[PDB]
Structure formats: structure tokens, C-alpha cells
Amino acid sequence: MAHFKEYQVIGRRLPTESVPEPKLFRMRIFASNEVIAKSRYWYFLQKLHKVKKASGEIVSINQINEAHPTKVKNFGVWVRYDSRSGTHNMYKEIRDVSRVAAVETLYQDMAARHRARFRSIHILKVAEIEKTADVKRQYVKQFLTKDLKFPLPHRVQKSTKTFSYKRPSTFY
């Protein structure tokens, strides 16, 4: 929950004399390190099957790099989150060059406008938007148009000397 990584985390119930070879289960977990991701895993699995971490074991944990990290993508993001008075589901769209960068900006948005801290957010699904025109949210659509050019008016240049000898300009 700092600067984000994706992990394939594979774990299983402990084997018993009754049942050797219990089924492996995999989750993709967005976390800041392996200790959180491993812990994050058991959090959801205890929300799904009957397992504790005490009763189970983790088979593998592996980082997942973006396959096309310099390729701009449009992402669908499905989020469940508790709010102050209730817990609800959301679809958001994020345009970025990886899933990590997109989850990185996902949690900020859920913090900024919904006041939702990490602990109160589940990421249900994050997938790439296959085509354009399947893009729903309009704040992404603006940057999908053909031959897209815009200015950046009112340039403010950080100074260094604390006194400056001319009236500055913003002209860019």
C-alpha cells in the first residue's frame, strides 16, 4: 500500500493424510512488498474458502511485470469499498502505462473524492479496455480523440534566488 507491485500469490490448504494434494489457489495482489501481499492473500482467501493462514501454506509468490510498459492503455477498474455509512461497488476508468501505475492512481482517487483509505477498498477486477469506443467514462474519452493537441497556459517557474529582478511572465 505504498508504491505498487503486482504479485501472483499461490497458496493452498495444508495437506492431510485424508487429503494430500489439496487445490492450489492464485490471487493477483497489488501491494508494496511480499510481506503485505502474502498477508493480503490470506485476507481475501479467508473471505472466500474455509482456511486460516495457520491451517494453510503459501506455495509460491512471484512478481508480475507489465508486458507492454511503454504502451498507453485504457483500464477498467472494478472496486468495492466501504463508505462511512455503507459499502458499495464502483466502475472507474484509468488511462496509464501499466496496471501498477493505474492502481497507484486508483487508490489516490478513492482517497481524494471518496475519502476511502486503503484498508476499506477491495479491487475486484482490473483489466485493459480492449478497444476504444468501449470506453465508458468521459474523462478518459477526451484524450482518445484524433490528433489531440492542447496548451498548458499560465506557466509558473519555480525560482531559486528568493529575490528576482524582473516581473516574471507565464507565456509558455
Partner 1 sequence: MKYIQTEQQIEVPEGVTVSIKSRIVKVVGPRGTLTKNLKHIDVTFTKVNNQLIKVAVHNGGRKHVAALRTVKSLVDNMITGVTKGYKYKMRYVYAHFPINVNIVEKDGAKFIEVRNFLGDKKIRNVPVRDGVTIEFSTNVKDEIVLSGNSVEDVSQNAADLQQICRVRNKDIRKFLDGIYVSHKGFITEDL
Partner 2 sequence: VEPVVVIDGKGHLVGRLASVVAKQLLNGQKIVVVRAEELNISGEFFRNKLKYHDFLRKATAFNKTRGPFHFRAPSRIFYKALRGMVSHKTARGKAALERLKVFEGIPPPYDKKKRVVVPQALRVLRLKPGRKYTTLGKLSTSVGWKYEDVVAKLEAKRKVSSAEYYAKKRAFTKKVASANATAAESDVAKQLAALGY
Partner 3 sequence: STDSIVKASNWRLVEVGRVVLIKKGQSAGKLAAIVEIIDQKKVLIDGPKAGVPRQAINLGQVVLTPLTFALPRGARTATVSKKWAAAAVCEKWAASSWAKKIAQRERRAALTDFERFQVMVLRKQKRYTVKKALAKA
Rounded distance between C-alpha atoms, residue 127 and residue 76, angstroms = 5
Three cell numbers at 72? 498507453
| CA nearest to 9, candidates 128, 35, 131, 87 | 35
Closer residue to partner 3 in complex, CB, 42/74? 74
Binding partner of 156, given Mg ion, partner 2, partner 1, none, CB within 5-8 angstroms per partner class: partner 2
User: 68: which 3 cell numbers?
Assistant: 507492454
Question: 94 has which bridge partners?
Answer: 75
Q: Which does 138 bind (CB under 5 to 8 A by kind): partner 2, partner 1, Mg ion, none?
A: partner 1
Q: Judged by CB under 8 A, does residue 164 bind partner 2?
A: yes
Question: Is residue 150 a contact residue for RNA (CB under 7 A)?
Answer: no
For residue 127, which of 138, 115, 135 has the smallest C-alpha distance? 135
Convert residues 131-160 into a mask of x (bound to partner 2 by CB under 8 A) and - (unbound). -----------------------x-xx-x-
Q: Which residue number, 118 or 143, has a Cβ lying nearer to partner 3? A: 143
Q: Please identify, using beta-carbon distances, which residue of 150 and 165 lies nearer to partner 2.
A: 165
Q: Give φ, ψ of 130 to 5 degrees.
A: -65, -60
- Binding residue for RNA, selected from 88, 118, 124, 127, defined by CB under 7 A: 88
Question: What does DSSP assign to residue 33?
Answer: S
Residue 40 is given by DSSP the state: H
- Residue numbers at the binding site for partner 2 (CB under 8 A): 154, 156-157, 159, 162-168, 170
